[PDB]
Amino acid sequence: KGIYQTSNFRVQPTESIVRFPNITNLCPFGEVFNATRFASVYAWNRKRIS
Amino acid sequence: AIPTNFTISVTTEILPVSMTKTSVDCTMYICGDSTECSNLLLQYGSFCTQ
Ligand SMILES: *[C@@H]1O[C@H](CO)[C@@H](O)[C@H](O)[C@H]1NC(C)=O
């Protein structure tokens, strides 16, 4: 007999939400992996990807 | 030396009698609202029962 504090079990999730930026531009995989000429290790090339 | 008069002094003293009752929920403190974490917390349940 008495009053008891209880932990959380009653709530359970049932759905999921995804929210990404809406972009339709395929990313330049062919310009870095299929490049005709690669750089020397000492002068290694760096490319921004955005 | 014998007193020939008197004073009626009122002194105030303060005593703490209680403190704020508190309760803690292990599940939502440690494993905030994720089921993956709360599953891992079952094996430590005894500790919270303490
Ligand atoms: C890479 O180049 C080869 C042949 O040049 C081609 O078959 C392939 O489709 C290319 N892959 C990508 C991701 O561009």
Side-chain angles (χ1 to χ4, degrees), chain A:
Chain A
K1 177 177 77 176
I3 185 167
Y4 300 101
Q5 317 306 329
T6 190
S7 306
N8 170 60
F9 309 98
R10 73 278 188 189
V11 182
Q12 318 89 330
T14 59
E15 74 182 29
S16 297
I17 301 299
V18 182
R19 175 64 60 175
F20 277 33
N22 48 8
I23 297 158
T24 53
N25 207 355
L26 180 66
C27 185
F29 285 105
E31 292 168 19
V32 309
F33 292 99
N34 243 323
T36 312
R37 184 176 176 86
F38 265 49
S40 307
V41 69
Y42 82 103
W44 51 276
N45 174 55
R46 171 163 253 175
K47 171 167 180 63
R48 179 67 180 271
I49 290 156
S50 81

